[PDB]
Each structure stands twice: as C-alpha cells, then as structure tokens.
Design a protein around this ligand. Structure first.
Ligand SMILES: *[C@@H]1O[C@H](CO)[C@@H](O[C@@H]2O[C@H](CO)[C@@H](O)[C@H](O)[C@H]2NC(C)=O)[C@H](O)[C@H]1NC(C)=O
Ligand SMILES: *[C@@H]1O[C@H](CO)[C@@H](O)[C@H](O)[C@H]1NC(C)=O
Lengths: 72, 132, 495, 107, 72, 50, 50
C-alpha cells in the first residue's frame, strides 16, 4: 500500500528539511543489508551469476549490485 | 525460626505511593522466593507480585502493571514493596512470603512448586488505607 | 465419509509390510486408504492445540507523548544536558541549531540542543513461543460403509477424536467392532518449533518463524515487562522535526498496524482466542492396521429388491458415491454390489465400501466406487437382477496419470521430503529417494531461500539460459534441473 | 484467563460432620492446586498442596482430591476450632490466582 | 518500517493459503508498472544505459529489467 | 493535505495515484467510497466458509 | 455436497458483502494560484538597540 511509493524523488524540495530527514535513506540501506545478512546463500548464487553472465569485470560488479537491489 | 515481621499499618492520600517492608528470619534470606498478596476486607486473596532476594529479578501481575515496584536489602535480609498512584480501592491488608527455590531468578512452575503463597509464614499482614 | 468433497485427497492403495503404512496429512487435506482387506478408513485432521505458551516480546504499534522538556547550552562550550534524560522511559535526541544576540546569549554560533519526551504505548503484540512440548494433535479417523447422513458433516461421532501428543505415542485407537487401530505420530518432525513464534495482535494472530520476528523493527520490549515501560528502540518510532534553523520538535509516529499487516503477509495466520486454535501445519503418522476386522463376516448375500434414492455423484476422479435403501426381510445381509462392462462379463470396477453392508434395515446406506475411464455398467441387483444403472466416466487414463503426476509434484513441493515418506515401504529406492532429496534439496531449495515470486521466476529463466549456452554436457545439471525446480516451484508457491 | 471457581460460597454445619468443597478450573491445572484455611484477623494458613497432601503439623481430618479441572477438599469430622474461611489456589502458568473463599458457620 | 520486511520467502508456508492470498504479488507488479507509466523518462535513460553497457543482447535485456526493479 | 492536525504539501499526481479508499470532494452523506479492494482483506481458509 | 447437504458435489460459487464506514480522514484540498499571499519584513540596519 502506501508502504511503497513514498513520494521521494518527485520534486519541489525546499531549502528546509522535510520529514524523515537524513534517516529514510540510511534506513533503506540498513534494511536491505540486514536482509542480506539473513539470506547469505542468495547472495552467493547471485554473485555466481555475476561471474557467469557478461563478466567483463565492471559488468559483473553492476549486475551484482542488482543482487543487492533484488528485493528486500 | 521461620518468621516474618512486616512494618506497621499506614494511611495515605489518593494518588500517592506507599512503601511496606517485609523482614524475615530463620533461614537463608537468599534461599526462598518472596511474593506479595493483598486482601481487601470485602474480598479474598489477590496475588500482587514477586521478587527474588538473590540477584533481584522481579515480576508482577497484570492488574498492578505499572503501579508497583519491588526491591530488597540483602544485608538486612529485608524486602520492600511499593505501590504508586494510590487509590481508595488499594485500601487493604498486604502480606509477604516465601518459596523453597531453585536458584538464580524468579519464577518457576515446572520444578515442582513452592507449596504455598503467603499462608505459612508470609508474616502478620499490614493494613494500608488510601483516604483523603 | 467426512473426506468426500474436500477434493485434494490422497488415495493410498495397499499396505503390505505385514502391517504398516506411511501417511502424511494436514488440515485442509484428508486421506483415504485401502488394503486387500480391512475396512477403508479416512484420516481427517483438525485443530492442533499447543497448551502452554510463554511470552517473548512486546511490540507496541502506537504511543503518545507529553511533558517533553528540551534544552540547549548556546555556546560552542558544552553539549546541553537535561535531567529527565536520565530516565530511559523518556526518549532523547541531540541536534544543533544556532544562537546569538537574537537568542541573546553568547558568541554567535551553531549551538548544541537536546530534547526528551515521556513515552507510553497503547497497543501491543503479545508474541509468545511454545516448546516442542505440550502441544497436541486431534484426529478423526472415520469409517466408510453406510450409516446415513453425510459423507460429510465432520461433526457427529464416528471416528472419535483420537488425541495425540509427543509426550505420548503409539496412538491406540478403537472403533465399533473392527475398530482396533494403531497410529504413530512423529510430531518432533513437525513444524520445527523453537523456530516458531505465535503472535497475537488485537485479536488476529500469526505464526512466523523466529529470527525475522526478532529482527523486526519498531519498539522493543522484553517478556518480563512488569511496569518496566523500559522500551528500547523508539528511534525508528517518534520522529523529530527540525525545521530550517530555530528549535526542533518531537512527533508521535502514528500507528503502523496496517503496515504490519502488509508485513505479515507471506505468512500463514492463526486464530488464537482461548489458549490456541492452531490450524495448518502438517504431520506424519505411520499406521499399523493388523488388528482390523472386515466389519462383518459369513453372511448371506442380501435377498433381493433394492430401491434406490438419488443418483450418481461422481466428485473428483472416481469415487461415485450412491445412496440406496434396501427393501425386504433379510436383515443385515451383504449387498451384492458390482461394476461391470458392457454385457459379457469382463467385470471391472473398483469398489470402495469394501464389503458394504445392510444395517438395521431401513436406513439410507451408501457406497462409493471407481468406474473405469469410459462407459460403465453398474449393477446392485441379483435374483431378478433387480437393477442396473448406466454410467459414463469421461476423462481418463493418460490424463489421469498426468494429473496424478501434478499432485505428486505439488506434494514434492509444499511438504517436502516427508512427501517421499508419504508412500509406504518402497524398500530401497523410496528411502534412498528421501535421503537424496533430503540433503540435496536441503542445500539447494534453501540457500536461495527467502526469495519471492518475481526473483524466483526471473533467476530461473536466467540460469536456465546460461545453462542453454553452456558446454560440456553439464547443461543438464543446469537446465533440466534448473528450469524444473525454478519455474515449477515458481508459480506453485506463495499461496 | 485461568478462572478458578469455588463452591459452595458458604456452609453451616454441626460439629463432627463431614464437609467437602469443590474447585473447578477453566483450564486443566493438573496437580497444582491448594487449600487454605484462614481465621478472621489472621493471616491465611496452609492445608493442602498438590491437592493431595497434608502438611506436617496439620490434623489428619483434612484431605484433598481431584485432578484435571475439578477438586474436592474434605474434613472428615467437623471440629469447632475449624471455623474459618477456606480457599483453593491455582499456581499453574503464574497469573497467580485464588478461589473466592468459603465461610463456615458452626451449628 | 514494517512497510518493508514483509516476511515472504522465508519458509514454513503450508498447504493452506496465508494472507494476501494471490494478491500481493500482482500488487507488487501493478504498482511498479504504474510508477513506470508516471516517469517514462527514467525508463528511457535507463534503457539507453542498457544499450550502452555490456550489450551482448541478452545482457541488455537483463540490466534493463534491473533498472526497472531499481525504483524503491 | 490535512491529517488529524499535521499537514503535508505534495504534488498532485502522486496524490491522485495514491492507493487506499477513494472518495470525491462532494461527499457529505455519500459514503460512496470507490476502492476498498486494497482495504479490508478477506480470508479464505482451506475450504469451507470465507 | 452432501455434507453441505444440497446438490451434486462440486466446487461452489459463494459471495459476501459488508457494511463499510470510515474512521479518520484526510481532508486534502488545493488552492488556485490566487487567494495566496506572502508577508515580508524588510528591516533596516543602523542601531537603535533591540
Ligand atoms: C451430521 O451428523 C449429525 C449428527 O448425527 C446429523 O444430525 C442428526 O440428524 C438425524 C436425522 O434425523 C437426527 O435424527 C439426529 O437427531 C441428528 N443429530 C443431532 C440432532 O444431534 C446430521 O444430519 C448429519 N448431517 C447431515 C447432512 O445429515
Ligand atoms: C507531565 O505533565 C503533567 C501535566 O499535564 C504532570 O501532571 C506530570 O507530572 C508530568 N510528568 C512528567 C514526568 O513530567
């Protein structure tokens, strides 16, 4: 629900701070990294995929940080 | 001997807090659990809560949630019950007593049981009245 | 009987072993079994009750603020302090604003500042856990063979309730006549509690595995409670405004209750009102049937002249229950029930009443059977042949085996290798199956766990692709395994 | 939660009589139950533990019985000094709770 | 917050349906596609990136669906 | 956008597309809400009821 | 089916409905690029005290 589409990039941003100011970002990161810690295997398999596909090195890095971005 | 001396009766104003003491003798003060049981005159017995002399662990009933703190002085072999936000309903007599205790921290069920709850030597009771 | 209509059901043919059978049954499912003898029985699974819980955690979904003093030193020098910062029942924060001659005091700089607030919560979550002890299953094991009313109405007394607890075993059960039956559970092989949490919200509850329920954000508080009001956390709750420069502010975060629902999706719920209602889950019992009469032996075959009431009633694949009411004298005599081909007796059905029987006379006795894939010729009549009913079963051979394979697939999913146990006594290759898939899928299905619809199907197609372009024949160990586990497990799950 | 019911609320009886009480539990409490005697103006006192057991120093006319949810306390021969109010106590689960009590009146 | 951790892959499931029951998936899709409709430009630039990097056609497809997934 | 007593300034479209029960400015008695599919969810345990 | 009691044994259609009535709202309004105004203090330097 409102759980997602959290009105962020959008526009109109003002000089004054808005709401979660300087949290929800580091929330987002901490969240997802936590979930990484919980399910290491999926990290493993994903990384393997990175070493499989493309793999001209920078490519690997990219598609990997997809693994990060996969799903909370 | 197995013995309990509570402090004498007191009266307080509503919304206040009262501190009742329970002193014991006749055993190792760290060898038994302490519980507080209250009796309103027109009612029977009600279990207020529990403190462990050894180590300080504590617990309380839902009704008194938020309202009651329990502490101890081992040196004096004494327990302190304290009630906050006193109200007329609180007016009653209070009682304290023991349990035969496995060890560290307080509350057990499975390990047999105490086989009482303020009836053997919980003390002599003490009267407290919340009044204006 | 008490099975019929639930669909999704588990026919188990034969026993052998001299005795036993392996049944894996859960809740919405049920099981019908047979042997070359002994009466057909049905295992239907109802509420699971775990008695003694113990309470670990207090999450609050809502709170309020008051009092809420704040301070600043103004200088440079010092980082401000306030006494109520001492009682952790307050919430605290440092921020920095500025001060000066407008503020009036010192030095003209960006100042330190603090705040605190009293914190109190009205609403909670009661989450408790239960040890793999006093928790118990209740089963109705119902006989077929007539005795009116309902193939249905699980209410009403036939198959008892056959309680069981891991604390006990061997599940000694009795029914009228033959009804000596021995079951064995393996509840310790069940849901794997100690991984489990039962979580009561305002009414509704949810069963979720432990770790996630630890890591979940929002205000912490330990099971001891007892006035503590001691809540850790609160930084994810109660956000603080700091508009452009001056002052600062504290804000009750607002109830997350719904959002919490959005979280607890992807979890089976549980109703809990009194002590437990627990549903779902699954269990494995092994069945030793020795101890069973056929429910009547050495009789006469009816007499003649049955008169039917109602008609055909197929339901899922087969069973075709019929209801009949005998008319005559002969007293509880066997009913000559047969299922035959066109003319020229080739006769083949399969009958599940096995050994149907007349009761006290008048009472609508009923039957179920499995005609072939095609035309069917059903005959209950004897001396003046009394009756014949034409039937046609559509469908049904290749398609049968196919759909069957679908079932066995689902059961390979959902329930795992306990599934491999769901047959009975395959000697070697059943066992070696259970082990191979045991450690095998143990490594593979999990580890690449914790993943959802999307990422599942997608990772599936990509890895099967990289398989398609791989060399050295290893593509199969990619590929066929890959696409299968990935895709098939992709759509079936997350229900 | 666990609701301990005590019956009857009061009894009057002649000396020497046999008297019995019954306590009924909303849940199975197994063998955890207790029987108090309390004389007015006195602290409560012990009688029965584990529902089955006398304490040392307790007269023998006292007994207790019952197992799952149901229990019976018994005095074989009523004795005048026994005038009191009696109780039963559920310890199970620890939301510690008592029976409402039963008063006696000598005849 | 609880807005994201929504206890999904996890395990334990059961034979019976759980909660949002054949919704939250199609929810997930519908909302992200909606957000795609709202911000077409970002789709454009991203796709361009796909045509830039790697590009090994299958690669393009992948990193593209990634940059679709990338919106929180 | 006024909530119980805090408010927020947000640009229009997003505030249109936002889920949860709809209802137009006219209402008063209408109680006409158009949505609710994203609000109250319906259980359907294994087979019977709902 | 026969358990339900009625007709021949199948997977049935079923429906439900419920009254619906709302708790706290959101009042969201808009303002036209009219009826809106700014207030400025334009302050001199140079002493007094203040
Ligand atoms: C399910 O079982 C119940 C219990 O036997 C059935 O209710 C009985 O119905 C018969 C029919 O005449 C009555 O004689 C009994 O008195 C009923 N039992 C009661 C009231 O406890 C019920 O009919 C069965 N379900 C169906 C669909 O028939
Ligand atoms: C909070 O303020 C109330 C007055 O509204 C006062 O009665 C109470 O004592 C205060 N509590 C604290 C902790 O400051």
């Amino acid at each position: 629900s409102v759980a997602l589409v959290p009105h962020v990039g959008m526009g109109l941003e003002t000089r004054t701070e808005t709401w979660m100011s300087s949290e929800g970002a580091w929330k987002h990161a901490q969240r997802i990294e936590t979930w990484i810690l919980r399910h290491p295997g999926f990290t493993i398999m994903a990384a393997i995929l990175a070493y499989t596909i493309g793999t001209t090195y920078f490519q690997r890095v990219l598609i990997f940080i997809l693994l990060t971005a996969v799903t909370p | 001997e197995v013995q309990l001396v509570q402090s004498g009766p007191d009266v307080e104003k509503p919304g206040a807090s009262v501190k009742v003491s329970c002193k014991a003798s006749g055993y190792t003060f760290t060898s038994n659990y302490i519980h507080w049981v209250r009796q309103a005159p027109g009612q029977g017995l009600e279990w207020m809560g529990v403190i462990n002399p050894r180590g300080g662990s504590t617990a309380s009933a839902q009704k008194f949630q938020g309202r009651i703190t329990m502490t101890r002085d081992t040196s004096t072999s004494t327990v302190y019950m304290e009630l906050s936000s006193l109200r007329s309903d609180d007016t009653a007599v209070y009682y304290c007593a023991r349990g035969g205790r496995a060890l560290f921290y307080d509350s057990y069920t499975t390990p047999r049981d105490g086989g009482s709850w303020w009836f053997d030597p919980w003390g002599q009771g003490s009267l407290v009245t919340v009044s204006s | 009987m008490r099975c019929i209509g639930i669909s999704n059901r588990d026919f188990v043919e034969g026993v052998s072993g001299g005795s036993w059978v392996d049944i894996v049954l859960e809740h919405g499912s049920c099981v019908t079994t047979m042997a070359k003898n002994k009466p057909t029985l049905d295992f239907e699974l109802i509420k699971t009750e775990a008695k003694h819980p113990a309470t670990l955690r207090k999450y609050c979904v809502e709170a309020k603020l008051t009092n809420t003093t704040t301070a600043s030193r103004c200088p440079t020098q010092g980082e401000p302090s306030l006494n109520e910062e001492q009682d952790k029942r307050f919430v605290c924060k440092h921020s920095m604003v500025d001060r000066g001659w407008g503020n009036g005091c010192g030095l003209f700089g960006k100042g330190g500042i603090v705040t605190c607030a009293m914190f109190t919560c009205k609403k909670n979550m009661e989450g408790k856990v239960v040890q793999p002890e006093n928790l118990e299953y209740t089963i109705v094991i119902t006989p077929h063979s007539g005795e009116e009313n309902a193939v249905g109405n699980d209410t009403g007394k036939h198959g008892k309730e056959i309680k069981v607890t891991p604390q006990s075993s061997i599940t000694e059960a009795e029914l009228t006549g033959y009804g000596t039956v021995t079951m064995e559970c393996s509840p310790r092989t069940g849901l794997d509690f100690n991984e489990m949490v039962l979580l009561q919200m305002e009414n509704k509850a949810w069963l979720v595995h432990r770790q996630w329920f630890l890591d979940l954000p929002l205000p912490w508080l330990p099971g001891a409670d007892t006035q503590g009001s001691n809540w850790i956390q609160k930084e994810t709750l109660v956000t603080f405004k700091n508009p452009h420069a001056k002052k600062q502010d504290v804000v009750v975060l607002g109830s997350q209750e719904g959002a919490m629902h959005t979280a607890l999706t992807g979890a089976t719920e549980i109703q809990m009102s009194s002590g437990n209602l627990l549903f779902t889950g699954h269990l494995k019992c092994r069945l030793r049937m020795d101890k069973l009469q056929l429910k009547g032996m050495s009789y006469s075959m009816c007499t003649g002249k049955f008169k039917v009431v109602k008609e055909i009633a197929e339901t899922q694949h087969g069973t075709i229950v019929i209801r009949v009411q005998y008319e005559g004298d002969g007293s509880p005599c066997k009913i000559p029930f047969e299922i035959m081909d066109l003319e020229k007796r080739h006769v083949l059905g399969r009958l599940i009443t096995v050994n149907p029987i007349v009761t006290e006379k008048d009472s609508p006795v009923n039957i179920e059977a499995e005609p072939p894939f095609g035309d069917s010729y059903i005959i209950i009549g004897v001396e003046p042949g009394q009756l014949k009913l034409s039937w046609f079963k559509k469908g049904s051979s290749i398609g049968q085996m196919f759909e069957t394979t679908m079932r066995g697939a689902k059961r390979m999913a959902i329930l795992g290798d306990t599934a491999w146990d769901f047959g009975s006594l395959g000697g070697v290759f059943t066992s070696i199956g259970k082990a191979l898939h045991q450690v095998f899928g143990a490594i593979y299905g999990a580890a690449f766990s914790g993943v959802s619809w999307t990422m599942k199907i997608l990772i599936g197609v990509v890895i099967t692709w990289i398989g398609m372009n791989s060399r050295s024949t290893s593509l199969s160990v990619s590929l066929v395994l890959v696409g299968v586990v990935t895709l098939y497990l992709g759509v079936m799950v997350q229900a | 939660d666990i609701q301990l019911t005590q019956s009857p609320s009061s009894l009057s009886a002649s000396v020497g009589d046999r008297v019995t009480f019954t306590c009924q539990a909303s849940q199975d409490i197994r063998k955890y139950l207790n029987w108090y005697q309390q004389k007015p103006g006195k602290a409560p006192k012990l009688l029965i533990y584990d529902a089955s057991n006398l304490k040392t120093g307790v007269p023998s006319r006292f007994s207790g019985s019952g197992s799952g949810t149901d229990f019976t306390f018994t005095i074989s021969s009523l004795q005048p000094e026994d005038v009191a109010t009696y109780y039963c106590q559920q310890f199970d689960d620890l939301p510690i709770t008592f029976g409402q009590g039963t008063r006696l009146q000598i005849k």
